[PDB]
Amino acid sequence: KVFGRCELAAAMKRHGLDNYRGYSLGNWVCAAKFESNFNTQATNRNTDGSTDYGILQINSRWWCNDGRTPGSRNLCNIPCSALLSSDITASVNCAKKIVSDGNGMNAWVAWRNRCKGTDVQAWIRGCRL
Numbered sequence: 558k559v560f561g562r563c564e565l566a567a568a569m570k571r572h573g574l575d576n577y578r579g580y581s582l583g584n585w586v587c588a589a590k591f592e593s594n595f596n597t598q599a600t601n602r603n604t605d606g607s608t609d610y611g612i613l614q615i616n617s618r619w620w621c622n623d624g625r626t627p628g629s630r631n632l633c634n635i636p637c638s639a640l641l642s643s644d645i646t647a648s649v650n651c652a653k654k655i656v657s658d659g660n661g662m663n664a665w666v667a668w669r670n671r672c673k674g675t676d677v678q679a680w681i682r683g684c685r686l
């Protein structure tokens with residue numbers, strides 16, 4: 558599934574991400590836009606043996622089990638397959654755990670490169686939330 562921008566914003570809001578751990582909702586929409594282009598099945602393989610999964614490109618070394626990554630900790634206790642679902646529930650549940658590390662949203666490459674420090678409220682412009 559490829560989410561619409563405000564479609565995704567609404568779902569993220571329903572799941573409590575607005576201002577979670579100090580990140581207003583637009584940070585999360587921006588992260589999804591630039592990590593995955595809002596695609597729930599986005600998957601990117603890294604040379605390090607890990608894979609980034611789903612709309613938020615969550616990495617398989619520390620957060621989900623794909624059965625093939627070195628240093629696996631599976632701290633969200635889920636198959637990485639769950640992070641490829643068309644609904645965002647597993648990805649948001651896991652994201653709340655990831656952002657609770659001292660890293661915060663720096664865990665997301667694309668957030669660090671295209672969202673941090675910007676006008677992230679623009680990503681929820683015209684969403685009526």
Ligand SMILES: [Cl-]
Binds near residue numbers: 568571644
């Ligand atoms: Cl939902």
Ligand SMILES: [Cl-]
Binds near residue numbers: 582583677678
């Ligand atoms: Cl915002």
Ligand SMILES: [Cl-]
Binds near residue numbers: 637638
């Ligand atoms: Cl899996």
Ligand SMILES: [Cl-]
Binds near residue numbers: 616619664
């Ligand atoms: Cl990570």
Ligand code: NA
Binds near residue numbers: 613615616665666
């Ligand atoms: Na990632």
